[PDB]
Write a protein that binds this ligand. Sequence first.
Ligand code: CGS
Ligand code: CA
Ligand code: CA
Ligand code: CA
Ligand code: ZN
Ligand code: ZN
Ligand code: ZN
Length: 158
Amino acid sequence: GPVWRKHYITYRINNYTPDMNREDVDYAIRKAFQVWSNVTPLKFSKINTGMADILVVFARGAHGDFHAFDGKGGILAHAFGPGSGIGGDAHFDEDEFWTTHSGGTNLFLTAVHAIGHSLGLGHSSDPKAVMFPTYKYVDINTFRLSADDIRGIQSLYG
Ligand SMILES: COc1ccc(S(=O)(=O)N(Cc2cccnc2)[C@@H](C(=O)NO)C(C)C)cc1
Ligand SMILES: [Ca+2]
Ligand SMILES: [Ca+2]
Ligand SMILES: [Ca+2]
Ligand SMILES: [Zn+2]
Ligand SMILES: [Zn+2]
Ligand SMILES: [Zn+2]
């Protein structure tokens, strides 16, 4: 449905996974937002005071919405499309083991996908798109938005 009317957008990390150290969580999330700001007029800013447009939450099982997480494996993450309140928020399953690299579920890659939803994208049919609804680890230096991702997001934020 609706897209952000404004081009200045805040995010707050509600809480931290104990799987990675704090600085690595910040880094992953920052880099994930950068991916999208790189191809749009959107500007993202992290806050810890006031109210963020996008709340980033790590939680297991039932966590206050109607989409409970399911333990280790399966559902990794979900996010809500643009809007007030819960709109834009991105939730990560704490029962996953979040990693800077290949040996669990990579936070950066998962967050790029989740944030795509937070900005209003649905799933892609293109297996090389970040919005493809299958997790597959890629070298975070071999990482790139596909043409379908870029086309998609630019159709929303021209
Ligand atoms: C690359 O980033 C990813 C983030 C999340 C997932 S996810 O497996 O958790 N996933 C898609 C899915 C996969 C398999 C079977 N049913 C649903 C959720 C999803 O698409 N959330 O955004 C779905 C259950 C809502 C996969 C990849
Ligand atoms: Ca929100
Ligand atoms: Ca899970
Ligand atoms: Ca965990
Ligand atoms: Zn719902
Ligand atoms: Zn949730
Ligand atoms: Zn998804």
